[PDB]
Design a protein around this ligand. Structure first.
Ligand SMILES: OC[C@H]1O[C@H](OC[C@H]2O[C@H](O[C@]3(CO)O[C@H](CO)[C@@H](O)[C@@H]3O)[C@H](O)[C@@H](O)[C@@H]2O)[C@H](O)[C@@H](O)[C@H]1O
Ligand SMILES: [Ca+2]
Length: 121
């Protein structure tokens, strides 16, 4: 993997991967494991999001990619997706701001930069 590490659910600013992406690059991601987005026994999330017996609002408590303050869905993973904007890849458990204090656990995530942008010409 270009980067492998943990994404803590309680990190309100996510986990910086150090991968500096450019528009037109392609990346793949897979994310494993389980986190809590609250203290109650039902408030569990996979990267794809809350367990559906306790749904939360759109995008909340899901694993997203933050690139230059833009957010993109990742969830359990993506394959060979084109990057739309330049920026460092930050992986984030997208809880509601200010509600990370009751979060626990971490995802195990792998990122591969499948290609760096180069046009056919
Ligand atoms: O949406 C993100 C948010 O989800 C959870 O909070 C929403 C949850 O709040 C209330 O649930 C309880 C009731 O006591 O209140 C706390 C809120 O932190 C929960 O632990 C507990 O279940 C509502 O009554 C529920 O309908 C609603 O789903 C999570 O707790 C927050 O930290 C935040 O991540
Ligand atoms: Ca929370």
């Amino acid at each position: 993997s270009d980067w492998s590490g943990s994404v803590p659910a309680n990190a309100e600013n996510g986990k910086s991967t150090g991968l500096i992406l450019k528009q037109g690059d392609t990346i793949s991601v897979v994310a494993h494991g389980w986190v809590k987005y609250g203290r109650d026994n039902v408030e569990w999330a996979a990267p794809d999001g809350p367990v559906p017996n306790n749904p939360q609002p759109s995008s909340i408590a899901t694993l997203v990619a933050k690139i230059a303050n833009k957010k993109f869905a990742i969830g359990n993973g993506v394959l060979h997706k084109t990057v739309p904007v330049d920026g460092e890849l930050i992986l984030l458990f997208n809880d509601v701001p200010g509600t990370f204090g009751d979060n626990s656990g971490e995802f195990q995530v792998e990122v591969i930069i499948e290609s760096r942008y180069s046009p056919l010409k």
